[PDB]
Amino acid sequence: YELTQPPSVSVSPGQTARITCSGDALPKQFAYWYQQKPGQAPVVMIYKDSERPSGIPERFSGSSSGTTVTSTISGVQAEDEADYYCQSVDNSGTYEVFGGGTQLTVLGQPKAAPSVTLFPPSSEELQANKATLVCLISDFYPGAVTVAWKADSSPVKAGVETTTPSKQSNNSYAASSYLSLTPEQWKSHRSYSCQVTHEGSTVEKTMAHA
Amino acid sequence: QQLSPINIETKKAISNARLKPLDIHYNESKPTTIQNTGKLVRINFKGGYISGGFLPNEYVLSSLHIYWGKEDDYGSNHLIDVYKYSGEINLVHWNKKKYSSYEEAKKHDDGLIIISIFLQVLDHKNVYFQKIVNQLDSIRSANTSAPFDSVFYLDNLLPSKLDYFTYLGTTINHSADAVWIIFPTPINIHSDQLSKFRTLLSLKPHYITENYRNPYKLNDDTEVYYS
Amino acid sequence: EVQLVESGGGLVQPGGSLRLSCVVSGFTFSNYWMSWVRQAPGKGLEWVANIKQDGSKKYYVDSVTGRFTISRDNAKNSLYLQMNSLRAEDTAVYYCATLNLELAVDAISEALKWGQGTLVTVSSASTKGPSVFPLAPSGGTAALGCLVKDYFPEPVTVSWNSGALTSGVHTFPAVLQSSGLYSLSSVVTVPSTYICNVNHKPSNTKVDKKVEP
């Protein structure tokens, strides 16, 4: 026994979203709806088909008809960009089940440029005979960039570890790149650089030793 | 403001025209779970509604409750002309249209509506009520709930004739206001069927021999209406 | 108010054993059926198992049956989960929660909250604590941070000044380096003493690094 909901649904701000679940035991059993944001636990938006908790916006409402149950979000806001899972029991009432999960993506999010802060190897890390340059990239939409490490105009490839982009609370994305050097590698150049490219725009940060 | 239950005096209760024939639809209704609350047996439901009559709109059925006494001839919450039945069943409905939750419904005077169906032990084995008796194995212990495991239609428990009384009272525990709908005509059951309800336990431990509440005085500003 | 403080496990070897726990407060735990839900990294929610109030009925997934087992103590007011013969596919964040309000006495809406969860990493690899380095600063704002390098497994919690400083703080998700050791860094932007509180529980480390220019 499983509950079927579409893995993806796309909507624009101010429009009425609809996410539906299906199951053979829905005539018997009540459903529940959980919103989940990045790096956070699930939170109920609607319970027992159509009952809203205090604290949840009036936007959120739930209806039921036969073997389907439909969570509805009116005048959708960017706030609501999140996964929505439906929850119910089988017709025996003993085996609990979650649906596949529906990724609700909100469209028309404006092009956000990435903020970049480049940190050099700490005074302490050089005493351990290592050197890690830390490039922190935050607040960019859509969620995808490319990172070019330049050792004094020369492109670097070895020792590079770059994160996959990660969805934040504010709905823009974040990433971080770690260039690994030895003390001498670091110290034998007048400058290194982290060059992050986002939608045909390359913004860079630079630091030396002295 | 007015506490429930009460005694409905037919001589004093007036006949209002606003009380039209009641629309009862438990076609969609199906029991989800059954419970031993510590006080009583309670079956929860999904689906079905009541409408028409004196109601401004339909109220969706929420739960079913059952009340009984230690003696077969004294178990109802409500009385009619100081007569007490073997037991009383309550059906709690709420204003889904107006309010966004059952908990929000309790907070308001137009939130809840409770039908009362009387059980009278008459030496007749009720085929339909037996389906509830078959679930009592699964909730013998106090504060235990099991899923209701049977095909069961609620509108087989409605009386023969559906003329009714009504008054502004409260929920049995006085937690909220509730407009009552009391059917004078009861349904027939056997003593052995009700006997199993007394073999349930409660919050030291002891069997639930009785769980009804004693009647209250009708206020100066509370009148009982009749269909 | 309701809180479901999900304590419990962490890193364990494949085929090993653990016992999670979930203490509860805010509602009559005794009246509710309770259930365990797990969620793997970047994956959906999966119901694991549930239990009846008294504990006379327990039901699990149609897998995992012969090795997982629930228990509960209503006096101590908590839910438990023994789990043996652990797999790599049991690597997930385990959540303690009430799901069904129809299966509950004196049901309340408030008791549908979920806790933070406990990460259960199953791996043949060994535990490793991080080396925490200070990231020093140099239009009216500045930026400084801490570098949590080379640890395994997840998670690590970086707060700033004992959880006082919240605004401006960004703790980035970790790279998973080819070496197999995680590594992250937490940054905070400030107006032009700051101490980061690093805590790796499996390694059982607690470093409180002071950042200075």
What kind and span of H or E run contains C36? Answer: strand C34-39
Q: Do the Cβ atoms of A195 and A176 come closer than 8 Å?
A: no
CA B167 from centre of chain? 15
Q: What is the dihedral of CA A46, A51, A56, A58, to 10 degrees?
A: 110
Quote the CA–CA distance of A136 and B204 in Å, as a whole number. Answer: 63
Quote the CA–CA distance of A65 and A123 in Å, as a whole number. Answer: 65
What kind and span of H or E run contains C37? Answer: strand C34-39
Quote the CA–CA distance of C93 and C86 in Å, as a whole number. Answer: 14
| Chain B residues within 8 A of A50 when measuring between CB atoms | 96
The first and second tokens of residue C178, run together, are: 């080819």
Asked if C105 lies within 8 A of B101 by C-beta distance, the reply is: no
Nearest CA to A47 among B65, C37, B102?
A: B102
Boundary of a domain, candidates C56, C89, C124: C124
Residue type at A207 in one-letter notation: M
Residue C118 near chain A (CB below 8 Å): no
Residues 6+ apart with CB under 8 A from A87: A3, A31, A32, A33, A34, A96, A97, A98, A99, C99
* CB interface of B with C, residues 84-103, below 8 Å: 101, 103
Residue tagged 């043949």 (tokens): C124
Q: What are the phi and psi torsion angles at B201 (to 5°)?
A: -110, 175
| Chain B residues within 8 A of C104 when measuring between CB atoms | 145
| Chain A residues within 8 A of B103 when measuring between CB atoms | 51
Sign of CA dihedral A69, A75, A78, A79: negative
The answer on C111 and C40 residing in a single domain is: yes
**Residues of CATH 2.60.40.10 domain(s) within chain A?**
1-108, 109-210
Label the pairing between strands B22-25 and B87-94.
unpaired
Q: What are the phi and psi torsion angles at A181 (to 5°)?
A: -130, 165
* Closest approach of A113 to chain B, Cα-based (Å): 41
The first and second tokens of residue C164, run together, are: 């006082």
Q: Do the Cβ atoms of A143 and A202 come closer than 8 Å?
A: no
CA C27 from centre of chain? 22
The first and second tokens of residue B46, run together, are: 């999904």
Residues 6+ apart with CB under 8 A from A141: A109, A110, A111, A112, A171, A172, A173
Q: Do the Cβ atoms of A96 and C35 come closer than 8 Å?
A: yes
Residue type at B226 in one-letter notation: Y
The first and second tokens of residue B22, run together, are: 């009641």
Asked if A50 lies within 8 A of B96 by C-beta distance, the reply is: yes
The answer on C159 and C111 residing in a single domain is: no
Which of A36, A96, A177 should one mutate to test binding to chain C, selecting the residue with the greatest count of C CBs within 10 A? A96
| Chain B residues within 8 A of C102 when measuring between CB atoms | 32-33, 44, 145
Exposure string (b/e) for A32-48, b if CB count within 10 Å is 16 or more?
Answer: bbbbbbeeebbbbbbbb
DSSP C177-210: -TTS-EEEEEEEEEE--EEEEEEETTTTEEEEEE
Asked if A27 lies within 8 A of B149 by C-beta distance, the reply is: no
Asked if A174 lies within 8 A of C59 by C-beta distance, the reply is: no
The answer on C210 and C199 residing in a single domain is: yes
For residue A7, say if its preceding peptide bond is cis, omega within 30 degrees of 0. no
For A93, B30, B41, B91, C201, the CA distances from B149, given in Å and listed in that order, are 9, 11, 15, 20, 46
Label the pairing between strands B177-182 and B112-121.
parallel
Nearest CA to B192 among B146, B106, B134?
A: B134
Label the pairing between strands C58-60 and C131-135.
unpaired
The answer on C151 and C99 residing in a single domain is: no
Q: What are the phi and psi torsion angles at A33 (to 5°)?
A: -130, 125
For chain A, the chains sharing at least 3 beta-carbon pairs closer than 8 angstroms are B, C
Domain range for C81: 1-124
**CA atoms lying within 13 Å on the CB side of residue A159:** 17
Quote the CA–CA distance of A129 and A121 in Å, as a whole number. Answer: 11
Residues 6+ apart with CB under 8 A from B6: B78, B79, B167, B169, B215, B216, B217, B218, B224
Boundary of a domain, candidates C69, C91, C124: C124
Nearest to B145 among C53, C108, C109 (CB): C53
What architecture (CATH level 2) is domain A109-210? Sandwich (2.60)
The answer on C131 and C120 residing in a single domain is: no
Quote the CA–CA distance of C74 and C72 in Å, as a whole number. Answer: 6
Residue tagged 């003390």 (tokens): A183
CATH number of residue B189's parent domain: 3.10.200.10
Show which residues on chain A lie within 8 Å of chain C, measured between beta carbons. Answer: 29-30, 32, 34, 36, 41-44, 47-48, 51, 53-54, 85, 87, 89, 93-98, 100-101, 117, 119, 122-125, 128, 132, 134, 136, 138, 161-163, 166, 174-176, 178
Quote the CA–CA distance of B75 and B89 in Å, as a whole number. Answer: 10
Specify the CATH class of A1-108 in words: mainly beta
Residue tagged 């006949």 (tokens): B15
The first and second tokens of residue A175, run together, are: 């990433």
Exposure string (b/e) for C63-85, b if CB count within 10 Å is 16 or more?
Answer: ebeeebbbebebeeebbbbebee
* Closest approach of B93 to chain A, Cα-based (Å): 14
Experimental technique used?
A: X-ray
The first and second tokens of residue B85, run together, are: 């039945």
DSSP chain A: --BB--SEEEE-TTS-EEEEEE-TTTTTS--EEEEE-TTS--EEEEBTTTBPPTTS-TTEEEEEETTEEEEEESS--GGG-EEEEEEEE-TTS-SEEEB--EEEEEP----BPPEEEEEPPPHHHHHTT-EEEEEEEEEEBSS--EEEEEETTEE--TTEEEPPPEE-SSS-EEEEEEEEE-HHHHHTSS-EEEEEE-SS-EEEEEE---
The answer on C148 and C106 residing in a single domain is: no
Domain range for B41: 1-227
**CA atoms lying within 13 Å on the CB side of residue B78:** 31
Asked if C102 lies within 8 A of B33 by C-beta distance, the reply is: yes
Contacts 24+ apart (CB under 8 A), B16-21: B16/B54, B16/B225, B16/B226, B18/B54, B18/B225, B19/B53, B19/B54, B19/B164, B19/B166, B19/B225, B19/B226, B19/B227, B20/B52, B20/B53, B20/B54, B21/B52, B21/B53, B21/B162, B21/B227
* Closest approach of B32 to chain A, Cα-based (Å): 6
Boundary of a domain, candidates C98, C124, C150: C124
Please, which residues bridge with residue C30 across strands?
A: none
Q: Do the Cβ atoms of B103 and B113 come closer than 8 Å?
A: no
C-alpha triplet A33, A36, A41: angle, nearest 5°: 105
Number of structural domains found in chain B:
1
Number of structural domains found in chain C:
2
3-class secondary structure, C130: coil
First to last CA, chain C: 44
Show which residues on chain C lie within 8 Å of chain B, measured between beta carbons. Answer: 30-31, 33, 52-54, 56-57, 100, 102-106, 108-109
Residues 6+ apart with CB under 8 A from C9: C18, C19, C20, C94, C118, C120
Nearest to B143 among C56, C57, C105 (CB): C105
Q: The sheet that has B83-84: what strands, in order across it?
A: B7-8, B79-80, B83-84
CATH number of residue C161's parent domain: 2.60.40.10
Show which residues on chain A lie within 8 Å of chain B, measured between beta carbons. Answer: 27-30, 48-53, 58, 61, 89, 92-94
